[PDB]
Structures are given as structure tokens and as C-alpha cells.
Amino acid sequence: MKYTGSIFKRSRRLGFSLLENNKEFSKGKKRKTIPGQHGNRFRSSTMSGYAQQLQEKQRMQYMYGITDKQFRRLFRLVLKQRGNLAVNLFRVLESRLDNIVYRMGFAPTRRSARQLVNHGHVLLNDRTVDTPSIILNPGDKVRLKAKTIKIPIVKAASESGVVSPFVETNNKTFEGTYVRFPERSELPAGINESYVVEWYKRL
Amino acid sequence: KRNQRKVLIGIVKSTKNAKTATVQVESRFKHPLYHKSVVRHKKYQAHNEGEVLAKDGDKVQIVETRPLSATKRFRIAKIIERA
Amino acid sequence: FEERIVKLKRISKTTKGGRNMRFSVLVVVGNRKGKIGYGIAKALEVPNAIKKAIKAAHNSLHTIEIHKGSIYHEVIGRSGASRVLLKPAPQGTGIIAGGAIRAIIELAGYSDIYTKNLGRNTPINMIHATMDGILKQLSPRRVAILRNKNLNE
Amino acid sequence: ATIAQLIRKPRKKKKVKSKSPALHYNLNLLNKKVTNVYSPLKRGVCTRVGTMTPKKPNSALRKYAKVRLTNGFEVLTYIPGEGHNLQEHSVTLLRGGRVKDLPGVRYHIVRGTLDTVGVEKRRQQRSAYGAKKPKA
Amino acid sequence: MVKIRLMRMGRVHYPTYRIVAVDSRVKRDGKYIALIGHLNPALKENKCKIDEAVALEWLNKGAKPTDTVRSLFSQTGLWKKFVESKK
Amino acid sequence: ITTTKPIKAHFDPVADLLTKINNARKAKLMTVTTIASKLKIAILEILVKEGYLANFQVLENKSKTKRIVTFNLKYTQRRIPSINGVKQISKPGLRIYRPFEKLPLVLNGLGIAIISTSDGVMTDKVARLKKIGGEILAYVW
RNA sequence: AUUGGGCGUAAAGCAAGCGCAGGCGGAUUGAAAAGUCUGGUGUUAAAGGCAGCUGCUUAACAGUUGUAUGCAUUGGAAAC
RNA sequence: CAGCUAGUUGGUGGGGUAACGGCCUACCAAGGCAAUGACGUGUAGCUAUGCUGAGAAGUAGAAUAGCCACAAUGGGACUG
């Protein structure tokens, strides 16, 4: 299963918004307690190192909608080269095609953005692709296939959106590019790459 | 003409057999795993062509040649004085 | 100053008519810049024991020196038949060690390191051995001073 | 000890033994001989089925089977689950695994095989004890 | 005839023959003596570069090429550097 | 001169020299004596030129029979020795031989190892300079 | 447990001695060069491992180029 | 598992083999191997390699490739 049905259940327990900030943005008296009958008081009485390593892992990967072996493969790929392991890892986790679509703001949610990629509504480098696990390099153009523009949602998405500094796009022409490699501080700070990278004694 | 030869100084045991003598060589090699330096011995056969009578305790050399017989495969080429 | 505990132990001495349950705790104190100390104390309750251990550790502190965030020469810690090894890891590998070893090295403001547990695994002996191995580190500038080859030799 | 001594007598490994040897040996007909090819799990035909008591720390009435493999070996076995369908010389299938409470017993019947029908009315994890998924 | 011949070292649906000099009584893609370039009959526009140095050594001391090798030697010009030198 | 004491050499020269240094370091001794040998003389020379110990004098009697060498160990005004740990790798019956590319580095270069390749005893760093390997005598740091 | 363990009380120093073969072994000089190091050449099939590149919509993968390791011969070094 | 080996070791003339050769043959001799492991029992096709490891090395010799041996079992020879 590449899709997880429930999304707010992750934001509650993990204490981190899967979206930008709208996971617990006062939606129906939004809470922060862990899901289930036992959310009364279990704050911290056995919080161990392995627990926080798992927690950081889950905050990092389900936010991108990735599975375990796929992300292990991503680690094996990023270990091939030489450089700062954490920054390179997070750059790889940022180079995914569906992630770039959200950075373009073509979809309200990353979950929605991943769906356009599968159906072929996203065209990359003049050759259409339908795989969300593409690794992109700087200077790659992205277009909306010049087809299926008349989505009542894509217009509501590309109209208003926060474009990060490390990428640039044109709203009207539906054309963008991957300008440069993002910096750690330019992304949400609730992800400590060190714990995830040092928990991998697997390889 | 890439013919070869093995410089193996040996210790002839005896010429007891008919016009044939046994040469003993103490090769030094390195132990395969424990890295120590040890020596092993193996008997070599040769035939006394007639010019010399290699008695007990002489030290000689060994050269390759055709198989003159079963288990007798090397002959004398160069000889150094007795002991 | 993170004061991350390592192993609390439930100890008790017998007495006529009852068992004097007075458990003890162990703490590690480090300023993440070179200050390191440890302290073991006992009390009847968790907070009292924790406070006593922190006071004992912070009262007796001792310094360590950092070169590129790592040990620079391999050293083995011989103490109480429980050996701990340190090695000069290259800059990319990051922190890898056991429980108590990771606690000590992380609170020492350190970085990348290579360790391997030897002998027993009782936390107090591991702490003693690791501290001994890290303080017998003889600085390159020190041997430069005590030799005639001070000029980068 | 000294290097000059281990050359004469090299070291010898411990050579630990298998946890369950019955499933490893096998023998054919037509010049029968043992070939010990470490097969994962064999089957067998039960010969004696009864109950026995466990050792000191526990207390129960555990049901066991004295099954005979495809070869001539006889091995004790524990019958898991709620009840059993062992039927006095009915063929079954086995699987390794040690039980602390029963000395000698070092095997389990895989429930869901030829005759040993799986535990009925078991809906927790449904995989061990050979249970089918109930209708939705 | 030590025969310069093609070897299907490659994956299914995507063959990749490597021109090689091997004895006639040897199976496909087996042991060989020397390697002579390769062929990729999926990529077009002169995708058959070879060594051209030791191939002449092979032909000049006895080697019968195969029909598929004919184009791979003619397009580069091996015949036009071999036939007259043969005389 | 006028040592007024009988001194003898233990055994193979490499082990004999190291034990005296280690024991003197541990007991805070300053002067020791031992029988002389050109291997030991050369290793003491390279040791003193690597700045690990004070004066050594090789002494001969009023004849050509016996030669002995006495060497003082480097100290400080605060009485801390320069020698920290000595360990011999070469050993009778365990002759160790490493090529140039496998030349060891003692405590990340902080220590000094004695490697007599072809020109007598000769330090590991100048061994890398001359890129010649051979016998490995002992680690000193 | 060669690197990488131990034998007082935890398993383990034979009851002791005479001892051949074996291992080890004082100082100095000479030669040889068997060990030791190093230079050249030959070889160590191909595929695979490692690094880079290309091609499969990207990986799995395939191809592509370099890559270790030992052996034999030859020329020197003389510290052990 | 302490002796094993009687074409077993050597020579002389001959035959035979693509060729050297106790491979065989007539004669004369009694040697050869073995504690640095012969002979015998049991097991196993060997290797490049897969897996694990940090490394020495452990592990099975999957796919594939090189070599070896076989084609119900035991022998014989023709053509080439």
C-alpha cells in the first residue's frame, strides 16, 4: 500500500502538521492529544532513544507519503555519493517530482499533487512522465502537459500559493523550473535529519 | 628459447639405489594464515650419470628434464664441493 | 547541560523484618563544549536520587579537548575488566555508539566517532573506562612542547 | 597460546548442533540410507495421542502427539489451539519450536494441514492455528 | 576457423551483441580470446564502433567473419584497409 | 667510567632495551645500563634524534672484549616522562614484515615506530619519504 | 581470540626429573642473497564486487571505461 | 587410522604409444613412501564467485561461465 487512508491521525500523535500548518488549525475545536481512548495523560514517562528515532523517521517519511523499502532505497542511492549525508539525504527527499509539484503550487495538497503525476497531467522536459519517484536536477522545466487545464481545483491552487525561494514558476503559463537546491532553514524545522541518518545501522 | 630452471640447493641422502640418488631440499615458506616462517622438506629423485658418486651428506643442485621414469623426474646439472 | 540519565538500578539491603528498598540512579552531565562529569547516588525516591546525582556530577567536573569534533588517535580504555575503544572517525560518519557511550560522547560536545564495547556491559564500569580512555588522550601540542620537534612534528 | 604451539595443533570450532534434528534426516526406499539434507519441516502419522503435565513453575494438562515421520524417527510434539482433530493414526504435519513446559517436546503441528483442521472460531491474527477469514 | 562472431550479452528484449573472436567449436557467449568492439542494434546512426587495431591482427593470421559482421566491418572501412594489404 | 657493578644483557636486543625504558619510566628512574649492540646503538641514536631521551654513552673496557651502552631518559622540571607507551611488534619466532603501502602510523603520527628497511633503523615518516618498507621493530609514543 | 582470550581462589600448570628431533638464542668481522623491501616485463579468462557515464518515462537492471589480488622471470639494496 | 608398497624403486636390450616413461616385455638387482602424516575410514565435483563481516577469514559452491567425469551397470574395439 502506497497510500495511507487517514492523515490527521498522523498529525495528532506525531505532534507535527503533515501540511504546512492546517492539520490542527482550529478545525472543529482542533486538539493535540494522541488518538484513541487513552489520550488522557501519557505525556513522557518512558520516552526512549529508539522511540524518538522512530518518531522522527515517521515525521519525515509519511509527510512525503513514502514506504519503508522505497525510502531505504533512497538512502542507499544517496549513500553512493560523497558529501554531507544529512543535507544530501534531505535534498533527495526534496527532489521527488510530486514534491516539486507542490513547490509549484499546482495542487492544494501534496496528496492531490501526487495524483496528477500518475494520471499524466504533469509533463517534464518535453516528455510526459507518470512516476512520482523521479529525481530532478537543477534547470528542469515542468509544464501541465498543455492538457486538462480546465480543472476547477488547479485554478484555485495555482491562483494563491506560497512559492519557496529555491524554485521559480509562472502562474499564467503553468511553467516552472527547479532553480536550486533548497537550504535546510528554508523548509520546516520540525525534522532533525541527524536522528534519522544515525538510526540507519541497517546498511 | 624461454627454457627455465629451479635453483634448488639440496642435501643428497644416499646413492644406495642403482646409479640413482635422492635429493632433499628444505624450502622456506610463509605460513598461510599464522604468518610464521617455517621450512618443509620433500624428497627429489635423480640418477647418477656416472661422473660423480654423491655419497651421504653432499649438497648439490637440481634441474628440470624429461621424465626418465616414474618418481624420477630431475637430474644433476651443477655440483658444489663436498662437506 | 542536558543531564540525560543512563541506568537507574533498584538496590536494597536486607534488615530484620523488611527490605530497605533504596534505589539509586546514574546521570551524565555535559555542557556540549568540553565539560564532562558523572555521579552516582542513592535515595528513597526518584527526584531525591536524581538531584543528588546531578549535584555530585556537576560538583566534580573535568575538561576535554576537541580537534575537528573527534578523537585524533586511537585509544583503548582499560578499567575494571571492561574495555572501550575510540577511533578517529572521518567527518561524515556521525555519532555511533552504545547507550552509555553515546550519552558520554554526545554530552561531550563531540561528533563522529567509532566505538566498540568489550568485556562486560555494566554501565558504571563502561563510564569509568570511557572516561579514562578519553582523559589519557595526550595532546599533539603537549608532546610538541615536551619534545624538541615542536614545529609541526 | 604461543604461535609455535598452535602450528602443531590448530584451533577447532565449537560446531554447535541444530535446535531440532528430526526434520533434517530423511531416508528413501530402494537401498534406504540417511542423507540429512536439513529439510525445513516434514509431515508424519500420529501413533499415540494423550495428555501430560508440565514442569515445576506451571500447571496445566497439555495435549501431545507421538508422531512418526516419513522416516523411522519418533518425536514428541505439542498440539496447539482450542481442541484438536487427532484421530489415532491420522497423518499430520509438523514444524520446529521448543516448549519450556514440556520436556522432550520440541515440535508443533502446523494447523491447517491434511487432517489437523484449524481452530474454529479464532479471529485474532487468524494465521497461526489455520483460521479462515470470516465473512464481512 | 577461429571465427569473429556476435555474442548476445544483454537483457531480454534489448539484445547487445559484442563482436568477438572465438573458436568455431565454442558455444555462444562463452570463453573467447580477444574483444573487438561491440554492437547495439537498438541505438541507430552508427552504433557499431570497434577497436580496428587487433581486428586486423586477427584477420591477417586466419579468421572467417560472419554475415552480421559484414556491415560492421564495411561501414567503418575494414575491407577497404584489408583487401589490398592482403595482396 | 667505574661502573663498579656487573651488568648483563637479557635476550634478543629489541626486547631487552624496551623493558628497561618502561621500568625506569614507571619507577621514575633516570639512568640505566645494558650491553651494547650495533642494532641497539642505532635504535638509541634514532630515538635520541627523535627527542625521546637524554644522553647515551657507549662504553668500552680497557680492552676490546666488552662494550656497554648507558642512556638517560628525557624528563621535565615537573617530573613527567616523554615516553608514554612502548610496544614491540617484532618478536623471536614472530618476525613481522609489512610492505611500504602497509606501513603503520603510530597514534596518528604522534608516536614513532622503528622500521629498519635497508639502511639501518629508520623512522616511519622518513620511511614513507623513501617509500621503502621492511622490518618493524617497535611502537614508541 | 595471528591481528583478538586465559590457567591462585571462577573450566585450565602434567607429581617431579633426565632428555633426542622441533622452536628460540651472546658480541664482532667477510661473503653469499634463502627469507625482507623495491624497479621492469608477462600473466592472474569473461561476467560479478567498487567508481564514473549512457540507455531503458526513474529506479530493479543492461551496457560502457578504469579498477584491485597473487604467481613466475629479471635488475638492485644488506638493517634483521 | 603405524606401517604401507612386489611392476612397487633402479638399470640393461626390445616392443608399443603422437611422445617421454615399469606403459609392457626377457634378465640383473631391493629398494620407494612415512610423524613436516604414508596407508584407511567418511565426506565432497574444483574455480571465478553469492551471503555475512569492518578485516583477517567464515560460509554454499544457486543462476552463469572455465575445467573435470558420466550417459541403465561393467567391459571391448572399428571408421576417423
Q: Are residues A21 and A54 in the same domain?
A: yes
- CA A90, A92, A95, A97 torsion-angle sign: negative
- Candidates A128, A52, A56; CA nearest to A93 is A56
* C1'-nearest nucleotide to the CA of B66: H20
DSSP lists the bridge partners of residue F88 as: F138
Chain H: bases < 7 Å from a protein Cβ: 8-11, 20-23, 29, 31-34, 36, 54, 56-57, 65-67
CB of D30 within 8 Å of a chain B CB? The answer is no
Q: Which grid coordinates belong to F125? A: 615518516
Are the C-beta atoms of residues F47 and F20 closer than 8 Å to each other?
Answer: no
Q: How far is CA A51 from the centre of its chain?
A: 22
Contact call for C147 and F108, based on CB within 8 A: no
Binary contact (F96, B37; C-beta < 8 A)? no
Residue E23 neighbours by CB under 8 Å, 6+ apart: E2, E3
H or E element, residue C127 = helix C123-135
Beta bridge mates, B16: none
Query: How near does any CA of chain C get to the CA of F14, in Å?
Result: 23
Residue A140 in grid coordinates: 528542469
Cell numbers describing residue C59: 560538583
C-alpha cell at C91: 567527518
- Residue pointed to by grid coordinates 518425536: D75
CB F137 within 8 A of CB F121: yes
What residue in C sits closest to F49 (Cα-Cα)?
C148
Q: Which residue of B has its CA nearest to D4?
A: B36
Name the nt closest to F93 by C-alpha to C1'.
G24
Residues A82 and A26 in one domain: yes
Direct distance between the N- and C-terminal alpha carbons of chain B, in angstroms, rounded to an integer: 35
Identify whether residues A119 and A65 lie together within a single domain.
no
| Side-chain half-sphere exposure of F92, counting CA atoms within 13 A | 6
C147 in Cβ contact with F51 (< 8 Å) = yes
CB F63 within 8 A of CB F32: no
CB E82 within 8 A of CB E74: no
Interchain CB distance below 8 Å, F96 and B35: yes
Helix axes F13-26, F38-49, angle to 10 degrees: 40
Domain ranges within chain E, ordered by starting residue: 1-87
Q: Which residues is B39 bridged to in the sheet? A: B28
**Of residues 49 to 68 in chain B, which lie within 7 A of strand G by their beta carbon?**
none
Q: Is the dihedral of CA B54, B55, B60, B63 positive or negative?
A: positive
The residue written with cell numbers 631521551 in the block is F53
At position A4, the amino acid (one-letter code) is T
My answer on whether A193 and A129 are in the same domain is no
B-F contacts at Cβ under 8 angstroms:
5
Domain interval for residue B77: 1-83
Which chain C residues are Cβ-neighbours of F107 within 8 angstroms? 73-74
By C1' distance from the Cα of D4, the closest nucleotide is G23
DSSP string, E14-46: B--B--EEE-TTS-TT---SEE-----TTS-SS
Distance CA D59, CA F18 (A): 67
User: Which one of C88, C147, C148 has the shortest CB-CB distance to F108?
Assistant: C88
The Cα–Cα gap between B68 and B46 comes to 9
Number of domains in chain A: 2
Q: Which residues pair with D52 in a beta bridge?
A: D62
Q: Which amino acid is at D91?
A: V
* CA distance linking residue F94 with residue F14, whole number of Å: 13
C94 CA: distance to closest CA in chain F (Å): 20
- Give the Cβ contact number of residue A163 at 10 Å: 13
Beta bridge partners of C76: C85
Q: Name residue C107's amino acid.
A: L
The answer to whether B41 CB sits below 7 Å from nucleic acid chain H is: yes
> What residues form DSSP beta bridges with C39?
C27
Is position A1 within any domain?
no
Instruction: Judge whether residue F117 contacts strand G, using its CB and a 7 Å cut-off.
Output: yes
Residue A105 belongs to what domain range?
A: 93-184
Grid cell listed for A34: 494522541
Other Cβ atoms closer than 10 A to F96 = 12
- With touching defined as 3+ CB pairs under 8 A, do chains F and B touch? yes
- CB distance A136 to A100 below 8 Å: yes
Q: Which amino acid is at A149?
A: I
Q: Single out the residue of E39, E15, E17, E38 nearest to residue E7, CA to CA.
A: E17
The distance (Å) linking the CA of D64 with the C1' of G61 is 51
Other CB atoms within 10 A of residue F12 CB: 14
The answer to whether B80 contacts chain D (CB < 8 Å) is no
Contacts of E4 (CB under 8 A, 6+ apart): E19, E20, E21, E36, E55, E58, E59, E63, E64, E65, E66, E69
The neighbouring-strand residues paired with C38 are: C28
Residue A129 within any structural domain of the chain: yes
Domain count for chain B, please give it: 1
What b/e sequence results for D20-52 when a residue is b if at least 16 CB atoms lie within 10 Å of its CB, and e otherwise? bebbebbeeeeeeeeeeeeeeebebebeebeeb
Is there a domain that residue A2 lies in?
no
| Beta strand spans in chain D (E) | 43-52, 62-69, 74-78, 91-96, 107-109
Q: Whole-angstrom Cα distance, residue D78 to residue D88? A: 15
Sheet of E34-35: strand order equals: E3-5, E20-22, E34-35
**d(C-alpha F139, C-alpha F141), whole Å:** 7
| Residue A162 within any structural domain of the chain | yes
Contact B75, B66 (CB under 8 A): no
All cell numbers assigned to F78: 615537573
Q: Taking CB atoms and an 8 Å cutoff, what residues of chain F touch C144? A: none
Q: A-chain residues within 8 Å CB-CB of C94?
A: 85, 194, 197-198
Please indicate, yes or no, whether residues A38 and A25 belong to a single structural domain of this protein. Answer: yes
Experimental technique used to determine this entry: cryo-EM
3-class DSSP state of A182: coil
- Rounded distance between C-alpha atoms, residue C119 and residue C76, angstroms: 12
Q: Which CATH number is A116's domain given?
A: 3.10.290.10
Which strands, in side-by-side order, build the sheet including C62-63?
A: C4-5, C24-30, C35-42, C62-63
* Alpha-helix runs per DSSP H in chain F: 13-26, 38-49, 124-130
Instruction: Say yes or no: A64 and A146 in one domain.
Output: no
F94 CB neighbours in chain D (<8 A) are: 3
Name the helix (H) or strand (E) containing B42: strand B37-47
> Does A195 share its domain with A162?
no
Q: How far is the CA of A37 from the C1' of G76 (A)?
A: 85
Report whether D24 contacts B48 (CB < 8 A): no
Mark whether E and F touch (3+ CB pairs within 8 Å): no
Q: What is d(CA A157, CA A121) in angstroms, rounded to the nearest whole number?
A: 15
E63 CB-near residues (< 8 Å, 6+ apart) = E1, E2, E3, E4, E21
Q: Scanning the structure block, which residue is given the C-alpha cell 604522534?
A: F110
Q: Which of residues 57-96 of F touch strand G (CB under 7 A)?
A: 67, 92-93, 95
Owner of C-alpha cell 507542490 = A102
